[PDB]
Symmetry: C2
Subunit: 250 residues, 2 copies
């Protein structure tokens, strides 16, 4: 039985005041530790949101992280910086970064190692595009993404890995995967872990669903055997809709 | 006579305490407004450094900025966010982002427009690699970089542009361009502005030198007719070395 995991990806949204308010409202609403809950503000607000999360079970996370630990990497944010702001997690490989910004598997694999080595936990994002789906390539893509990102990880390092399945066709489109479609993808990802990394790792690693998650569809998704929670996009920007999803994971 | 411009690029360095201390020490040392001075902390420390710069002439800047104004761009930081932290400037096209991260001219051109439209001023970084230099391609590169980044800018928008020439061979290598080499590059860049954008823009736009600038070499660089200041890397991490360069631009 995997502890459920509900993460709120605020993306490139919120003013400083809105960030503080959203963080504080989510913190106040998370009144037990039965579900792992984390929120992911944009970099400039991390120390401010970290402050309002103090005294609550809610973790702080960053939306990206450098592949390097320090130094001459203009514009990049290091694991050390994120840890100092209060982060426990970093998202790596989000579809917007893979497909719009253009991050490679080499870069993603380096980020995973660097984040873990420095003491962060990692939410590794993966998933297929509409074009890939329509050509039945989703299993090829899932295998490439999972095995490339995890290349070189120790068994122990997997203890700090969460995988987020986000079909790209489901992001910001209002077209959620049916729970049955989500379940099929999660089951395949778990099988890929099992065949290469073994039963303990496959059965212990949370695989969470991302993509057009809303309070109206979360129950069906949450009930699926290989779905361990949610990576929430737009619905994470309102505290009540985010908390509704958290409470559904309980 | 162009007002000189001295910018401190802290890159992926400093703890929160160190950032506050460095900002405060630079602020205290800048006791007139004869030189435009700006410091560029990593994103998470921007509000903290903005605070310690209050009441001084020193401006705040960011090391990068999104090409988009808001929304579903995980990991990206918007002009609106930067402005709220107190930023007046954003660096765009730094060599580490062009060559290590992999930012394209399309992305850079979009960033320049987006930053300017939202109210930021822009430090556009450009410059050639060792391979390009050795093959005498530097003028081809300078033209491509300047004309691609500025494509579509209005004459009025140029009022908020600074160009930084950083030869890539000079970054972090301890091999500064001789002042005469810097001057040749700056003169060529200014000619490219003149031939396409006219005399007013060419003669008014600050072109600053970046790359292994140190208090020991700044005077020779500062004296060159087409050098209008410095984009300072490693030397910006100590307040006294940074201030020495600021005072030399006076
Ligand atoms: Ca096993
Ligand atoms: Ca003219
Ligand atoms: Na890379
Ligand atoms: Na998301
Ligand atoms: Na792009
Ligand atoms: Na620099």
């Amino acid at each position: 039985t995997r502890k459920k995991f509900v993460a709120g990806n605020w993306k490139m949204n919120t003013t400083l005041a809105e960030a503080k308010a959203l963080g504080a409202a989510v913190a106040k609403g998370v009144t037990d530790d039965r579900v792992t809950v984390a929120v992911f503000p944009p970099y400039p607000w991390l120390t401010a949101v970290g402050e309002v999360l103090k005294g609550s079970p809610v973790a702080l996370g960053a939306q990206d992280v450098s592949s390097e630990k320090k130094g001459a990497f203009t514009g990049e944010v290091s694991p050390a910086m994120l840890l100092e702001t209060g982060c426990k997690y970093a998202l790596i490989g989000h579809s917007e970064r893979r497909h719009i910004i253009g991050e490679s598997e080499t870069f993603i694999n380096h980020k995973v190692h660097t984040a873990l080595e420095e003491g962060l936990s990692v939410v590794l994002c993966m998933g297929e595009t509409l074009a890939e789906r329509e050509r039945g390539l989703q299993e090829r893509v899932f295998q490439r993404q999972v095995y490339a990102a995890c290349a070189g990880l120790t068994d122990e390092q997997f203890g700090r890995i969460v995988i987020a399945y986000e079909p790209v066709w489901a992001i910001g489109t209002g077209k959620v995967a049916t729970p049955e479609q989500a379940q099929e993808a999660h089951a395949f990802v778990r099988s890929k872990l099992r065949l290469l990394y073994g039963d303990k790792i496959a059965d212990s690693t949370p695989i969470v669903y991302g993509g057009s998650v809303t309070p109206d569809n979360t129950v069906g998704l949450m009930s699926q055997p290989d779905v361990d929670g949610a990576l929430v996009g737009g619905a994470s920007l309102k505290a009540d809709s985010f908390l509704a999803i958290v409470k559904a994971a309980g």
